[PDB]
Amino acid sequence: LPIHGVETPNDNELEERFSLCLDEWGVDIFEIDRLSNGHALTTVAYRIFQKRDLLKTFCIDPHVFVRYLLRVESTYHADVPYHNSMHAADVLQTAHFLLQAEALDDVFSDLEILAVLFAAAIHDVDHPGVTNQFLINTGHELALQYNDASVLENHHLYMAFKILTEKDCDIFANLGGKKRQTLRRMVIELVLATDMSKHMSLLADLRTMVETNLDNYADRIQILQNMIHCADLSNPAKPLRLYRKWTGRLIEEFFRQGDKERELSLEISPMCDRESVEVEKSQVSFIDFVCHPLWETWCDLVHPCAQLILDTLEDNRDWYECHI
Amino acid sequence: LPIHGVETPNDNELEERFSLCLDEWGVDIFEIDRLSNGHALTTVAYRIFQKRDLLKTFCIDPHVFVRYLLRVESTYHADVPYHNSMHAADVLQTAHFLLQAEALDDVFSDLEILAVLFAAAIHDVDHPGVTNQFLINTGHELALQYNDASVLENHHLYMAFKILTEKDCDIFANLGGKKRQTLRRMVIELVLATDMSKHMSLLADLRTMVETKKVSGSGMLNLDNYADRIQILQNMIHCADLSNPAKPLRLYRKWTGRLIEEFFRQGDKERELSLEISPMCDRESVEVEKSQVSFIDFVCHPLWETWCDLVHPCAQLILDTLEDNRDWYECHI
Numbered sequence: 017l018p019i020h021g022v023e024t025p026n027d028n029e030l031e032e033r034f035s036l037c038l039d040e041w042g043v044d045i046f047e048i049d050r051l052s053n054g055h056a057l058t059t060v061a062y063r064i065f066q067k068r069d070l071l072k073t074f075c076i077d078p079h080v081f082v083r084y085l086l087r088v089e090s091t092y093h094a095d096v097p098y099h100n101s102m103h104a105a106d107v108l109q110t111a112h113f114l115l116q117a118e119a120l121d122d123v124f125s126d127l128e129i130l131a132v133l134f135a136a137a138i139h140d141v142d143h144p145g146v147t148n149q150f151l152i153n154t155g156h157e158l159a160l161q162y163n164d165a166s167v168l169e170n171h172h173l174y175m176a177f178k179i180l181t182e183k184d185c186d187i188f189a190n191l192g193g194k195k196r197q198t199l200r201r202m203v204i205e206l207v208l209a210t211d212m213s214k215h216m217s218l219l220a221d222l223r224t225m226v227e228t229n230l231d232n233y234a235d236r237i238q239i240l241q242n243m244i245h246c247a248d249l250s251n252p253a254k255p256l257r258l259y260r261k262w263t264g265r266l267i268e269e270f271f272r273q274g275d276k277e278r279e280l281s282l283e284i285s286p287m288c289d290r291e292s293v294e295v296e297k298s299q300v301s302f303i304d305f306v307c308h309p310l311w312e313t314w315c316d317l318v319h320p321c322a323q324l325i326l327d328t329l330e331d332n333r334d335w336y337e338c339h340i
Numbered sequence: 341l342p343i344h345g346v347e348t349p350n351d352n353e354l355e356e357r358f359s360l361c362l363d364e365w366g367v368d369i370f371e372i373d374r375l376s377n378g379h380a381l382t383t384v385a386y387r388i389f390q391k392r393d394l395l396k397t398f399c400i401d402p403h404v405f406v407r408y409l410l411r412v413e414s415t416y417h418a419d420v421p422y423h424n425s426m427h428a429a430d431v432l433q434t435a436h437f438l439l440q441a442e443a444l445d446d447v448f449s450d451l452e453i454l455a456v457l458f459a460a461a462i463h464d465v466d467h468p469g470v471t472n473q474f475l476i477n478t479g480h481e482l483a484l485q486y487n488d489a490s491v492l493e494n495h496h497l498y499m500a501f502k503i504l505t506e507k508d509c510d511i512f513a514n515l516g517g518k519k520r521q522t523l524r525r526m527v528i529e530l531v532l533a534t535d536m537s538k539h540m541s542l543l544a545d546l547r548t549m550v551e552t553k554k555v556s557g558s559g560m561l562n563l564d565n566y567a568d569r570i571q572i573l574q575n576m577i578h579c580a581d582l583s584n585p586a587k588p589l590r591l592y593r594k595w596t597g598r599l600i601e602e603f604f605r606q607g608d609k610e611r612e613l614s615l616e617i618s619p620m621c622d623r624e625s626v627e628v629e630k631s632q633v634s635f636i637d638f639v640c641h642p643l644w645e646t647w648c649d650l651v652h653p654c655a656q657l658i659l660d661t662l663e664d665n666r667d668w669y670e671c672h673i
């Protein structure tokens with residue numbers, strides 16, 4: 017069993033970086049992926065899970081863990097610039113980080129921590145590099161199949177759970193039936209919370225909660241839904257170099273989508289037009305209307321355990337306002 | 341085009357029955373299926389869409405309608421005892437009856453009426469004879485695909501909108517874009533409201549609207565809002581689906597013999613897979629009569645009572661027949 021779960025060409029350099037970076041906000045996942053040779057998701061997940069004793073706690077065989085994580089990782093599409101396994105690993109680590117706020121100390125069961133971190137790692141698996149709305153305007157097969165509701169998010173979940181079915185990949189094989197049913201329902205609810213069409217409702221829920229303690233599932237689970245959705249939308253609150261990197265990729269993906277939407281004669285989807293999308297304006301607008309309202313609330317929830325996040329978010333917002 | 345959409349051996353019998361029965365509570369859908377050579381769904385739908393002027397209003401070509409309906413009808417499985425095209429024709433006619441209550445006069449737009457009646461016709465298409473819970477308990481493919489959520493209801497929808505693809509089957513071809521898309525959303529919301537795990541939630545919405553009507557004082561409820569209206573239609577198609585126990589006893593009993601056959605087949609499969617046998621699915625343990633009284637006390641009667649309270653006094657006959665049927669089964673224990 018190697019130190020990082022799967023063998024890499026740079027075990028000592030990755031170990032140094034993991035020991036300094038895994039509990040920090042602002043991890044260079046791109047470099048982890050280069051040093052691990054395509055294995056940021058696999059190595060990040062493995063070491064998060066050991067650090068939180070989750071393999072021991074849930075009797076997960078560490079070989080079975082690595083084998084499953086390698087399958088999921090190779091199910092993300094390398095040739096998709098943003099929605100690949102690097103994005104998954106970033107989301108995973110940012111979720112791991114979010115959980116450590118003092119204000120949330122001693123609150124979540126282990127099973128709930130297991131759920132949210134598993135969700136993060138799988139939440140974009142097999143993404144094809146187009147949006148839900150594009151699936152729906154082309155009448156793509158998955159859009160028809162899911163009746164327009166959460167088309168990708170549903171697909172991500174389906175793929176993740178079909179992989180658990182493969183010979184010697186069943187990482188939850190040693191939970192009881194009751195813990196496996198409650199785990200499955202939690203994972204479903206969590207990855208579904210990554211669907212943008214839920215953003216308004218989850219955030220009204222979080223605002224309501226802050227405007228008041230939590231030992232009802234109902235509240236905890238609403239906090240974990242907001243949390244994974246925060247991690248997913250963390251990029252603009254990351255150090256600027258990392259924000260810009262993630263952004264260049266997202267836009268390259270969107271623009272590529274705009275070309276199939278242009279080279280099939282349709283109403284080019286939003287921010288997807290190479291010709292006349294204002295990239296710096298487009299980010300300022302995403303912050304003001306989407307990302308800032310979310311992070312402000314989250315940060316209000318965990319007062320003051322996440323002040324840095326809200327500070328960098330505000331700086332990158334101003335930086336872009338200037339470079340338009 | 342033949343008088344009833346498809347040709348039948350018994351046009352004049354059917355004419356007579358459709359002329360007298362289709363605005364009544366409790367229509368003998370089995371006999372209409374026998375008389376039309378297995379086309380109850382197609383002939384009932386054609387005839388209701390005629391009586392509502394829905395072909396004319398939405399510019400639906402009658403040959404296109406008939407073609408689409410035959411395909412839907414075919415895609416119900418005739419070997420499933422209960423969830424076949426006869427169940428669909430029952431649900432469709434019953435939803436048609438329920439829209440007539442005087443307390444609903446002019447509440448709904450034509451496109452809403454179009455939606456709920458289309459929905460009813462498709463709402464169980466391709467049903468394989470086993471529940472959601474079974475597909476989830478077996479991790480069947482559908483259940484994995486849909487993440488345990490309204491599994492069949494989602495598949496019924498998928499199959500119905502695909503058939504609309506097919507060459508010369510797009511009944512909604514002449515609606516505008518903003519219309520096909522508002523229709524599509526409504527139809528989805530309406531077939532999803534037939535998933536039983538929505539029952540409690542839907543019935544609480546309906547309770548809210550009843551209490552909201554009783555306190556209004558023009559005793560009329562404000563329904564300018566689409567989202568209130570859709571709640572009512574959701575409850576209504578769900579009522580229609582669960583209308584069997586409030587149907588004339590003879591009919592309720594026939595529907596029920598079919599439903600128990602399907603249930604018992606599923607518990608056989610469960611047994612064979614060494615799995616928990618679902619409620620009402622065990623031929624070795626189930627007591628049919630007791631189970632009906634229980635389903636009526638706990639699910640059916642609270643739903644209908646609330647529906648009847650909303651449209652009071654327009655659906656009195658329904659609650660009465662439901663209570664007499666309850667009491668008949670109690671005495672046969």
Ligand SMILES: Nc1ncnc2c1ncn2[C@@H]1O[C@H](COP(=O)(O)O)[C@@H](O)[C@H]1O
Nearest residue numbers: 140210212248249251252263266299302
């Ligand atoms: N930097 C950004 N600018 C604009 N939209 C973003 C950005 N980051 C995330 N999003 C949005 O958030 C969604 C997150 O879900 P996913 O793309 O499946 O990871 C995206 O598809 C976009 O709608």
Ligand SMILES: Nc1ncnc2c1ncn2[C@@H]1O[C@@H]2COP(=O)(O)O[C@H]2[C@H]1O
Nearest residue numbers: 464534536581582584585596599632635
């Ligand atoms: N007579 C009955 N007894 C028990 N359950 C019923 C009865 N009639 C309808 N149902 C239930 O109501 C459901 C409605 O959904 P279907 O038409 O898909 O399958 C059905 C069963 O849960």
Ligand SMILES: [Mg+2]
Nearest residue numbers: 139140168210
């Ligand atoms: Mg996603």
Ligand SMILES: [Mg+2]
Nearest residue numbers: 463464492534
């Ligand atoms: Mg059904």
Ligand SMILES: [Zn+2]
Nearest residue numbers: 103139140248
């Ligand atoms: Zn994502």
Ligand SMILES: [Zn+2]
Nearest residue numbers: 427463464581
């Ligand atoms: Zn039904």
